[PDB]
Design a protein around this ligand. Structure first.
Ligand SMILES: CC1=C(/C=C/C(C)=C/C=C/C(C)=C/C=C/C=O)C(C)(C)C[C@H](O)C1
Ligand SMILES: [Cl-]
Ligand SMILES: [Co+2]
Length: 453
């Protein structure tokens, strides 16, 4: 297992004004890339069981006139602080329990009320200073919306300047609570509540011009099992394919229920994009046949000699006829893909042509390719390098760009032979390297990051 290092702890935290750059970083890149992910997979003798359990570490790539600065710090969550100060796992994670939700916000980062927050799937984000990467603390919402489970995949409406997300109240009468947050406030407005007997694990959701679409995979929990069983969070979820998948369509301006539609069972972590066209909604999803991927992302499998056991996902375009009818899909590409990203700022909620992601096709290795899928031409461009494992491709559009793929792709890449990571900058159009910046250590395999101007 050459990539074993990507799932090993990084204890080193440093701050460097300049990384060694090769190539040239465009002058117009003047923002900051923040990467989030797990970077500590044990506390004393106690090991975290699952990739999703690792204690959050932020990585900062800040750009000035062709130079790039780097800093990394562990998020000083109560989860981290308690582990550091008692050498005991102290909060319940995705798949590990101690020997009252974790604030181990290891999944994604965004801005709420002009503040930088790290996010996981527990109710409250964790605020951090982008200058220092210091932790300010739990970011409280100012509202009466009940939640136990949420996403670290909020959507953002650039027209209305609203963050959009949902949170599940998990109780004997559970609710999916769809909400929005206006710029310069931490108050969430409830759009709508959908009552549900057995809440589904929905890592992300779709947003169109007029709608939120919750795609309810039949991977579901009995609320009382979560409240009372001895078992870590994710062990309480069951695959029930007889339920099918349910597309719940909510008007995200007035909370009206547009309708519910069923397809055959499938599972997904990541939506790609969705859009309305005539009397139809198209929903592009990185779909697995079932939920078995969840058990494949336990560390003993990820570190083991059986990684061809890890199920592949593919881009499915689901067509919802609002007129009425069963939801059918077609494949947009033959490539196995995860960690999808688009020209979000210009093409989220809109008809589009280009998806960036990591190849999980295993042509030559595990997760060793960046891929750019051309939906129109049904073709792909590939980036790879011997014994290198690239992270999520973050797209940044060029100034006054007239094309969907005019800009840069930023990917944190593990170099296994060098036992250190580099930031790869591709031109999004050619999908060829324009620069890289060396990091003095390995960046463990992370989840999501965002570029802030
Ligand atoms: C939400 C909830 C709980 C905690 C859930 C937790 C720790 C979820 C973590 C999700 C993560 C980190 C997912 C990451 C996905 C990345 O690709 C209790 C504390 C285990 C029980 C409570 O009733 C409900
Ligand atoms: Cl129950
Ligand atoms: Co995710």
């Amino acid at each position: 297992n050459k990539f074993q290092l990507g799932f090993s702890t990084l204890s080193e935290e440093l701050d460097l004004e300049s990384l060694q750059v090769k190539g040239t970083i465009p002058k117009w890149l003047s923002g900051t890339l923040i990467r989030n992910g797990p970077a500590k997979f044990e506390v004393g003798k106690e090991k975290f069981q699952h990739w999703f359990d690792g204690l959050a570490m932020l990585h900062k790539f800040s750009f000035k006139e062709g130079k790039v600065s780097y800093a990394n710090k562990f998020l000083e969550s109560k989860a981290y602080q308690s582990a550091r100060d008692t050498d005991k796992i102290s909060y319940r994670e995705f798949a590990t329990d101690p020997c009252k939700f974790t604030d181990n916000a290891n999944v994604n980062v965004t801005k709420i009320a002009e503040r930088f927050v790290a996010m996981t799937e527990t109710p409250l984000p964790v605020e951090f200073d982008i200058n220092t990467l210091k932790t300010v603390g739990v970011f409280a919402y100012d509202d009466k919306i009940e939640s136990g489970l949420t996403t670290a995949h909020p959507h953002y409406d650039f027209v209305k300047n609203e963050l959009v997300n949902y949170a599940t109240k998990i109780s004997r009468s559970s609710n999916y609570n769809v909400y929005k947050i206006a710029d310069k406030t931490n108050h969430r407005n409830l759009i709508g509540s959908i009552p549900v007997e057995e809440p589904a694990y929905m890592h992300s959701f779709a947003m169109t011009e007029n709608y939120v679409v919750l795609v309810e995979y039949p991977f579901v929990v009995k609320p009382l099992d979560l409240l009372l069983s001895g078992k870590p969070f994710i062990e309480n979820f069951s695959w029930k394919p007889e339920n099918g998948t349910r597309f719940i369509i909510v008007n995200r301006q007035n909370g009206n229920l547009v309708g519910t539609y069923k397809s055959d069972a499938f599972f997904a972590f990541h939506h790609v994009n969705a859009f309305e066209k005539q009397e139809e909604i198209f929903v592009d999803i990185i779909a697995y046949q079932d939920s078995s991927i969840v058990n494949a992302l336990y560390l003993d499998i990820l570190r083991g000699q059986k990684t061809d056991t890890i199920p592949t996902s593919h881009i499915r375009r689901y067509r919802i006829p609002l007129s009425g009818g069963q939801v059918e899909y077609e494949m947009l590409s033959s490539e196995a893909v995860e960690l999808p990203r688009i020209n979000y700022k210009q093409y989220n909620t809109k008809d589009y042509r280009f998806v960036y992601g990591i190849s999980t096709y295993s042509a030559s290795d595990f997760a060793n390719q960046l891929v750019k899928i051309d939906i129109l031409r049904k073709s792909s461009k590939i980036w790879s390098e011997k014994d290198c494992y690239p992270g999520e491709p973050v797209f940044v559009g060029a100034p006054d760009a007239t094309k969907e793929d005019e800009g840069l792709i930023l990917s944190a890449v593990l170099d296994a032979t060098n036992a250190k990571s580099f930031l790869l900058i591709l031109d999004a159009t050619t999908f060829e390297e324009v620069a890289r910046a060396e990091v003095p250590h390995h960046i463990p395999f992370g989840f999501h990051g965002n570029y802030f101007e």
